[PDB]
Design a protein around this ligand. Structure first.
Ligand SMILES: CS(=O)(=O)N1CCO[C@H](c2csc(-c3ccccc3NC(=O)c3ncc[nH]3)n2)C1
Length: 238
């Protein structure tokens, strides 16, 4: 409760995306040095890591009737969510052919972020490419801490499952998981040992890593620190 920002230091602009509890808006935050910073405002503070969304602060606006309007202030992510970015990469006017190297680097960043959170025994519970945001340096961070296709059958090993699905989203550059399978069918599909199929031109080594995330027994799944190194090692071999 010393995380608060004076509401007068904040100017709210147009809507950036729509969130669980309300709109996410662009804003300008006047900082302690007198300068103004572009921010995102949703209408965590202990976390410090480059691949994890930092909290800048909180403002409570007073409505006209006096009902609280709490707002969460986050850094501005020029390139928006990773899911949308991948989709745009498949179009001429959006970003170029993203090579394999850049796709793995997105995976490594996310693994680094999740390694940090899992080490502090913090569960994400909603990890997906749409919840991974892109910084202006094009490094990815993790954000947004019940979409059936990211949930594991049965902990941090649930998060590991979702990260594997996220790796698949990245490898496919934005395909919805499990084409030709409905949401109500998912439990039976998985219970019979079926998993996300290997993407088209994607290396066997990469597919082994993502597959290890979906082992039936969560104790057979690797930790985030194991995954991170496996991904780093794969990247270095290209
Ligand atoms: C995953 S989430 O919980 O962060 N979330 C949930 C609601 O939709 C938001 C969203 C979607 S596309 C977008 C965006 C698009 C262009 C430029 C900047 C943008 N956002 C940010 O800079 C920003 N920073 C912190 C949160 N959002 N924002 C993101």
């Amino acid at each position: 409760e010393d995380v608060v920002i004076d509401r007068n230091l904040l100017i709210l602009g147009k809507i950036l995306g729509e969130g669980e509890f309300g709109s996410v808006m662009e804003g300008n935050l006047k900082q302690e040095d007198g300068t103004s910073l572009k921010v995102a405002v949703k209408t965590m503070k202990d976390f410090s890591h480059p691949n994890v969304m930092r909290l800048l602060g909180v403002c409570i606006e007073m409505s006209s009737q006096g009902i609280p309007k709490p707002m969460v202030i986050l850094p501005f992510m020029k390139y928006g969510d990773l899911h949308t970015y991948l989709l745009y990469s498949r179009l001429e006017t959006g970003p170029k052919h993203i090579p394999l190297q850049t796709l793995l680097k997105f995976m490594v960043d996310i693994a680094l972020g999740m390694e940090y959170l899992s080490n502090r025994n913090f569960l994400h519970r909603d990890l997906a490419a749409r919840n991974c945001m892109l910084r202006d340096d094009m490094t990815v961070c993790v954000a947004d801490f019940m979409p059936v296709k990211w949930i594991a059958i049965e902990t941090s090993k649930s998060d590991v499952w979702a990260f594997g699905v996220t790796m698949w989203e990245i490898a496919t550059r934005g395909m919805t998981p499990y084409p030709g399978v409905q949401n109500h069918e998912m439990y039976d599909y998985l219970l019979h040992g079926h998993r996300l199929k290997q993407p088209e031109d994607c290396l066997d080594e990469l597919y082994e890593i993502m597959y290890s995330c979906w082992r039936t027994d969560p104790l057979d799944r690797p930790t985030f620190s194991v995954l991170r190194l496996q991904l780093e090692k794969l990247l270095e071999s290209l």
